[PDB]
Write a protein that binds this ligand. Sequence first.
Ligand SMILES: CCn1c(CO)nn(-c2nc(O[C@@H](C)C(F)(F)F)c(C(=O)Nc3c(C)cnc(OC)c3Cl)cc2F)c1=O
Ligand SMILES: Cc1cc2nc3c(=O)[nH]c(=O)nc-3n(C[C@H](O)[C@H](O)[C@H](O)COP(=O)(O)O)c2cc1C
Ligand SMILES: O=C(O)c1cc(=O)[nH]c(=O)[nH]1
Length: 358
Amino acid sequence: AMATGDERFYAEHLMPTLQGLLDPESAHRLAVRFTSLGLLPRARFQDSDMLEVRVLGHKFRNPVGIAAGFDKHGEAVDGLYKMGFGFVEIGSVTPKPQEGNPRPRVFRLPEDQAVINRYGFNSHGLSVVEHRLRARQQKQAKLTEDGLPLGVNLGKNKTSVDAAEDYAEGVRVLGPLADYLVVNVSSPGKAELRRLLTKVLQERDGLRRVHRPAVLVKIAPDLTSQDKEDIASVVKELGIDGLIVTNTTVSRPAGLQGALRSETGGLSGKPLRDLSTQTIREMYALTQGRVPIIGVGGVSSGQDALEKIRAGASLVQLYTALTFWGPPVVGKVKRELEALLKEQGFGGVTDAIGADHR
Ligand SMILES: CCn1c(CO)nn(-c2nc(O[C@@H](C)C(F)(F)F)c(C(=O)Nc3c(C)cnc(OC)c3Cl)cc2F)c1=O
Ligand SMILES: Cc1cc2nc3c(=O)[nH]c(=O)nc-3n(C[C@H](O)[C@H](O)[C@H](O)COP(=O)(O)O)c2cc1C
Ligand SMILES: O=C(O)c1cc(=O)[nH]c(=O)[nH]1
């Protein structure tokens, strides 16, 4: 096809050329800028009804989202929908502005189709992002109505003594502008998690009904069996709306070839894929298939997307694949997912959710 040819040109020539000419943070910064200005093709992949998912109190036109980290400050939301993402997650956004870690803090492992990052939650802050989303609030209301929801990932400041209050601040400021909110959880213990999430949910429940977002918990793949058992219990107990599975890994799987493999940070991309899919599988089973999962980590194809869906994910996200494949990856994943769904006898995405477990 014309799509596969375009996909090959970006993957084989354009992206390796551009990534050779730019440091990885400049590449990211330019990507946000080009996307913010809408410098993209119109829309050759019109989304099939097969790709539609209804979850988290919302229509999703397709299940392929852009993961948190690409658009930390909500600068490129409209361009991301133009790129063909069925939903956009912005952030992480911290309460106060902060610079994050010293540069260099992003590293490419092209031999592994992986990235390492240690951004350290660089953020323009809730106030800047609030006013930025307010400027396009009604445009977003229509987009959400048309099946294109907006998520916001809420972080905390580096020097914060009270993590729960930073997240609470985020619920109050950005919850009215979001379809869903995300709080990242690291390794717990169980009572501390219950306390934090209770406060987050209380703050969410205090917003007016019309501006009341879903609340999701995002987990790393590096948790113990007991951490995962505890998270599942608390999430079911409190009525947490969903799980995002997973963040980057602090592990370094055997077989990484990139020179920069020993850089401190979170590893993303292909080496994360099956660690992430197995975490989805575990969390789906520990929650009895009753907590919607957003599957993320190493999605670069329809097969990768479908494996996460069959393992228990209602929706997927990607980021790292975009750095190697460019904008055509979104259409690629969607086309390939649709084809595989047909090949496996599923009417749509919804039928495939948790199919491995049945
Ligand atoms: C992890 C940090 N990180 C890295 C490094 O690891 N790369 N990266 C990305 N870089 C991108 O392009 C650069 C090479 C750019 F300099 F060209 F901006 C894009 C991207 O989509 N670029 C675009 C757009 C938007 C429109 N039109 C295009 O071509 C006609 C292209 Cl190539 C997406 C990314 F996630 C990124 O976030
Ligand atoms: C450069 C970079 C920055 C990221 N920043 C964030 C962030 O601020 N908050 C967050 O929850 N996840 C962040 N992530 C994690 C991604 O959202 C995603 O969970 C992870 O990269 C796995 O997906 P992928 O393999 O498709 O990239 C970041 C990832 C990368 C590569
Ligand atoms: O900002 C970061 O460093 C960051 C946040 C996060 O949640 N995940 C990640 O890989 N990096």
